[PDB]
């Protein structure tokens, strides 16, 4: 059975490479350094693809492609658009949103390229999976739609924007990439998320002191998912 | 020998599957449809991306990771960001840069990424076969700096950022990530744009009108480029 798990920076998927302390096989390609392991009965490839949409496509892509993962689980932090996700707070994303997306001119809604769509769906049995477990350790497991584009968002004038147009509850900068690359391929996908801050004025200060322990919840938790299948 | 022809609407790839005339086997893949194919000598694969940096980034990939090319070219059209690009111009882009990018809340200049560049560079080897081509056909070849975003930029307030921000001379969304996922795999490459509107406030209508005619004067080009290689 071949695993992919994927982070955006180095700082998230470190924790993983600890959690699991099995002998990581460094494989590099396409500016991403992949590393093939072996844990229990699963064959795992773990990496980060580095920051963004492009960054982020492409890692899935080859992850898919040159090591023929079956699954794709994914874990970071991200920035809250909600009063009720509040920082370490763990989230599930139920569907993904592309939020910088703008083809207005041509009277098309934001977020909508044609031959797509603006929503993109994640697995439903592994969005499962995360739940039982999240229910068994007695931890608050929230769900909801996840932002994702090329811009840290830092100012409360964004923030409104995308909870009134996609109703979104956090946001990031990778998400919407992994699980589209994923859906178009037909591999499941799973996106967790940590929060790290509240995407506010205060946004980068806040990410600065939480980034180590945030990647550290949502490393813990994905562990825990990987070890039931 | 193998080249990869990427479009981003089907309409950029059409008429080179014409120009070619020859008999394209269909391979679909990860939501794309790639056409192979044989000339003179060469092996070549064709295909339509789609709309924005995703899915450019997918294709790009694929193509390279399952088709094993070993040139790109791209060809499509994009929107005027100065005076002396009218029209149905040709440009080849020497840099090109993500205009959306935006992490400034971490005191980084805009268009960055850690890990990564402001410019990525094109093939040195491929925009000069251009030159000496666009000269031999007496065709005015203009050259410079392509912006890629995932907004259809129609508006001066815009416009203007770009040239200064960047120095810019064309806009369209994927030349970017095509030139960064060939970078990052060692794959020259080499994008060539026709414009098709002035990115203002009619960019729109005149998108609409000129896109047929500026795909036609890309397509030209580059079937004459793939002729002497
Ligand atoms: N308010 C927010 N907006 C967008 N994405 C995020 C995220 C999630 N990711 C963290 C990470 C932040 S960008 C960055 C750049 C330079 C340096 Cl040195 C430190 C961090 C990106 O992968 C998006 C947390 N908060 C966010
Ligand atoms: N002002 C501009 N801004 C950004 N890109 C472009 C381009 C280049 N590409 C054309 C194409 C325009 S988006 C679109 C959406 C729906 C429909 Cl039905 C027709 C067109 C994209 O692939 C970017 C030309 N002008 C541009």
Same mark, same amino acid.
Request: hydrophobic share 45%; aromatic share 8%; with cysteine.
């Given at each position: 059975?071949? %695993?992919? %798990?994927?982070?955006?920076?180095?700082?998230? /998927?470190?924790? %993983?490479?600890?959690?699991?302390?099995?002998?990581?096989?460094?494989?590099?390609?396409?500016? !991403?350094?992949? &590393?093939?392991?072996?844990? &229990?009965?699963?064959?795992? /490839?773990?990496?980060?693809?580095?920051?963004?949409?492009?960054?982020? $496509?492409? $890692? $899935?892509?080859?992850?898919?492609?040159?090591?023929?993962?079956?699954?794709?689980?994914?874990?970071?932090?991200?920035?809250?658009?909600? *009063?009720?996700?509040? %920082? !370490?707070?763990?989230?599930? =994303?139920?569907?993904?949103?592309?939020?910088?997306?703008?083809?207005?001119?041509?009277? &098309?809604?934001?977020?909508? /390229?044609?031959?797509?769509?603006?929503? #993109?769906?994640?697995?439903?049995?592994?969005?499962?999976? =995360?739940?039982? @477990?999240?229910?068994?350790? &007695?931890?608050?497991? *929230?769900?909801?739609? @996840?932002?994702?584009?090329?811009?840290?968002?830092?100012?409360?004038?964004? *923030?409104?924007?995308?909870?009134?147009?996609?109703?979104?509850?956090?946001?990031?900068?990778?998400?919407?990439?992994?699980?589209?690359?994923?859906?178009?391929?037909?591999?499941?996908?799973?996106?967790?998320?940590? #929060?790290?801050? !509240?995407?506010?004025?205060?946004?980068?200060?806040?990410?600065?002191?939480?980034?180590?322990?945030?990647?550290? $919840?949502?490393?813990?938790?994905? *562990?825990?998912?990987?070890?039931?299948?």
């Amino acid at each position: 059975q071949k %695993i992919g %798990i994927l982070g955006a920076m180095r700082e998230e /998927i470190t924790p %993983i490479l600890e959690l699991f302390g099995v002998d990581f096989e460094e494989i590099p390609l396409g500016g !991403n350094v992949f &590393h093939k392991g072996v844990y &229990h009965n699963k064959e795992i /490839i773990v990496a980060y693809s580095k920051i963004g949409k492009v960054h982020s $496509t492409l $890692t $899935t892509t080859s992850m898919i492609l040159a090591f023929g993962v079956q699954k794709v689980l994914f874990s970071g932090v991200a920035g809250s658009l909600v *009063k009720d996700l509040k %920082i !370490n707070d763990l989230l599930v =994303a139920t569907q993904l949103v592309q939020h910088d997306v703008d083809l207005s001119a041509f009277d &098309h809604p934001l977020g909508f /390229i044609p031959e797509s769509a603006i929503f #993109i769906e994640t697995s439903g049995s592994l969005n499962a999976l =995360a739940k039982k @477990i999240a229910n068994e350790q &007695h931890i608050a497991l *929230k769900e909801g739609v @996840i932002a994702s584009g090329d811009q840290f968002v830092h100012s409360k004038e964004r *923030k409104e924007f995308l909870v009134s147009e996609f109703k979104a509850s956090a946001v990031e900068m990778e998400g919407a990439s992994v699980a589209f690359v994923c859906q178009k391929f037909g591999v499941p996908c799973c996106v967790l998320r940590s #929060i790290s801050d !509240n995407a506010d004025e205060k946004a980068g200060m806040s990410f600065d002191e939480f980034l180590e322990k945030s990647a550290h $919840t949502s490393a813990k938790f994905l *562990k825990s998912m990987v070890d039931e299948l």
